[PDB]
Design a binder for this molecule. Sequence first.
Ligand SMILES: [Zn+2]
Ligand SMILES: [Zn+2]
Ligand SMILES: [Zn+2]
Lengths: 156, 96, 338, 83, 88
Amino acid sequence: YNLIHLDPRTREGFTLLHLAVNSNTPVDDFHTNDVCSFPNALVTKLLLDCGAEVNAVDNEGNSALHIIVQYNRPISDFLTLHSIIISLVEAGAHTDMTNKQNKTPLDKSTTGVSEILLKTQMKMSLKCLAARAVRANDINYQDQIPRTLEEFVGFH
Amino acid sequence: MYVKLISSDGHEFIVKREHALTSGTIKAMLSGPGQFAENETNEVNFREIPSHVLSKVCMYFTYKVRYTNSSTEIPEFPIAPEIALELLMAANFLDC
Amino acid sequence: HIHDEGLRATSNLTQENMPTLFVESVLEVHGKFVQLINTVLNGDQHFMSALDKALTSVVNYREPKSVCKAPELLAKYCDNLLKKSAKGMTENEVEDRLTSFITVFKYIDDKDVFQKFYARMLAKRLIHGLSMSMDSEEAMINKLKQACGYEFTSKLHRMYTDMSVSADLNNKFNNFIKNQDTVIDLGISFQIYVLQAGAWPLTQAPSSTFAIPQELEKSVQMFELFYSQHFSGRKLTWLHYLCTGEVKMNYLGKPYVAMVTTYQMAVLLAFNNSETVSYKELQDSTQMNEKELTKTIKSLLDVKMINHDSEKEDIDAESSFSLNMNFSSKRTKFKITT
Amino acid sequence: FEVKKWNAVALWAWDIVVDNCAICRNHIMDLCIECQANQASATSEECTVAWGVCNHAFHFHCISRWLKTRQVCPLDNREWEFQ
Amino acid sequence: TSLKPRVVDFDETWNKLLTTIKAVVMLEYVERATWNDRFSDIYALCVAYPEPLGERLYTETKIFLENHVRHLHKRVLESEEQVLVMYH
Ligand SMILES: [Zn+2]
Ligand SMILES: [Zn+2]
Ligand SMILES: [Zn+2]
């Protein structure tokens, strides 16, 4: 919890949660490959229990949910994909969060398993549909909505 | 089983009660000293939501109840450009 | 224990420099017991809350059938730190001794009384020039804003802002005097400390009533025109008793200057036309109440610039005085304090 | 024995009892909240007082920022026009 | 009136809100119109212009709670042998 509140940031903007769910996080050639294999369900769950910023955004734009859904092994270790997906979603994750390239996590999936597994967790909301409609047609929302909605519109 | 959502203009949008409780505040507005367990009116007075956007909220309620578990290429919700940014804060107030 | 420790550290003080002793004693107790809690009791939250509660019961320790001395003592401690004096402290020293002071201040639990007392002392230190550093006043005002809410230091910060923006007002007034139709004669050097009513604790209460002297009515008129043209919709009421002016006594030897209040200044006007002036002969021009006139006359008789022609030195209906031509002062800058 | 230097002190009120920028909830004669921050860049004079026809007082920055989207006076919901 | 951020005076809305939250924590009777009108007051405070008063609303509610349960604690402790039925 102390380290999470320190809020570390890798040169690519990867927070502590982004690395725990990314399969691109390197593990050194020693015996750590036998145990410390990423993404890990237990590591992500422990980070979320310690108040990790689930909606943290790197400089690329990907949230903690865009990074996982690009996982290239969705079947052999489907347990540690499903566990991280549900752990993210039930804590604070915004399933419809739009990165800097206008990509929904469903768009940046490249996998049917992750796409439909996330769709099973996507609680549709009128707030998200209205945010998408506001962003798509570029309505000037400055100071005409609550401030928390302004960053919410920025999310979509 | 029919909650009556009044609007800022008096447009009483009577909707199915199970449909309306998909929103948090309408679930909360009927919870507590607003229950009125007599199935007579069960009315809700939105003194800050215009009728034209409360109607879209009610269409959203019906749309969500219908297409919750389907996910079989659900049709896109028609939000007019002018009524957005009113629907946005309406759904902020009436959460989901 | 901490409670009793406070009663063995702050209740034993006997007058003297109590403002610098009460706060220092409470700070010493706090520093001893927060060091002990942090290094022995692991800095536990419950024990820190116990420390804060005990010191809350210690700082504003109310003697039965009496008001707590904590707010006035803390206000006087801040006054003594901020007021310029020969104590030799520097800006760093008074900045440190006020940052540590806030630890005592948070336990007052009677913040309104401290606000009233601090406003009363800040008014004096800003009007009479007793402030050591204006930046120090700003720092102390800002520290109380960080301790408790802005509504606490609303009037205080407004008083500080009023006293800060006075040179600019005087410069604008001089510019208006220069660029106002003909060259208005500046027979006086008129610097004004304009203040916001409601902010400052000063109350005019003009039941005493006063009449401005003739040589000052022109300045009143030109400043009224300046403050009605440059600024709009502002009732400028005149706070007479705090106005002071200097006079050099060229009537006798020209030895010194005689800085004196306006109420006592209006005494000298009638004495300027004729040396012998009676009580009502003085009063017809000032047109003030009997109490303030008697007080000013008594203060001037202590100054003894005017000598009582009547043998009865006590103030009565006649009460005719004159200029004491034999009176002289040791210094060349004979300021009359109140 | 004549007056040559004078110090004078005079109070002043606003001729209308107003005691807070209702937008900012700090006093109008104080700096606005927007100018409360970046006080080094602010000159402490730009925080002028703006008066409407409704005899309500706010800082110029505050009522200007409020007027960029809402054309109505913040306190009483009627149209706003400067003095 | 709409749902846009508007200028809200906390010291008056809270007083209009305290009379409801004080009567809903004691299970007194508050009319349905007032209860439905309060949901706008928390909303108005939480999106107030130009600084949301969610911190002020939460702090004042916490202060009221600690000044209400402590009032209940004195009453329960006031009764000597009935502290169980006064607690319940
Ligand atoms: Zn303002
Ligand atoms: Zn400003
Ligand atoms: Zn107005």
